[PDB]
């Protein structure tokens, strides 16, 4: 749950930045494709966490919410940055 938190904080902080980065993209493409890549390798981390929430109902929910926000910025990027 100290790592559950770091995972989630990291995710939430970055979805924010990468989401803008994508929009502000219609040079820069360089810093961006890089973040997207890191954010892809965060999923395993979320998967493992989520699989580990022994009935901590609420902690589990925090994980999945983060996976949501993550999925959404990942879907955006694939559609726009193609």
């Amino acid at each position: 749950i100290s790592k559950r938190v770091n995972a989630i904080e990291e995710v939430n902080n970055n979805v924010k930045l990468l989401t803008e980065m994508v929009m502000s993209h219609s040079s820069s493409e360089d810093l961006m494709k890089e973040l997207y890549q890191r954010c892809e390798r965060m999923r395993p981390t979320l998967f493992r966490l989520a699989s580990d929430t022994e009935d901590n109902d609420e902690a589990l929910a925090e994980i999945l919410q983060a996976n949501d926000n993550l999925t959404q910025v990942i879907n955006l990027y694939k559609q726009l940055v193609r």
Binding site: R43, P44, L60, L64, N67, T71
Partner: protein
């Protein structure tokens, strides 16, 4: 609430499946490109080595040649010298 709990887990499961699939595909491509490129360079090197050896041989034939060339100069000299002493000895 659980309905959404379950739904989102289900969504993760499909995501893990898709990602495991791409990752396994990628791993294979890498193993393929290693195998290919390994095989190529091996061949390239083999040619290079055959050529390199033809080259050693050629160089050795030139050493024989240059050696005879130095003998040529030495005979010519041995005559010249002999032949000078001998004009003195007349």
């Amino acid at each position: 609430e659980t309905r959404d709990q379950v739904k989102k887990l289900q969504l993760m499961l499909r995501q893990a499946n898709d990602q495991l699939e791409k990752t396994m595909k990628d791993k294979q491509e890498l193993e393929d490109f290693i195998k290919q490129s390994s095989e190529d360079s091996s061949h390239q090197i083999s040619a290079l080595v055959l050529r390199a050896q033809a080259s050693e041989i050629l160089l050795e034939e030139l050493q024989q040649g240059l050696s005879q060339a130095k003998r040529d100069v030495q005979e010519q000299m041995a005559v010249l010298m002999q032949s000078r002493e001998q004009v003195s000895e007349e």
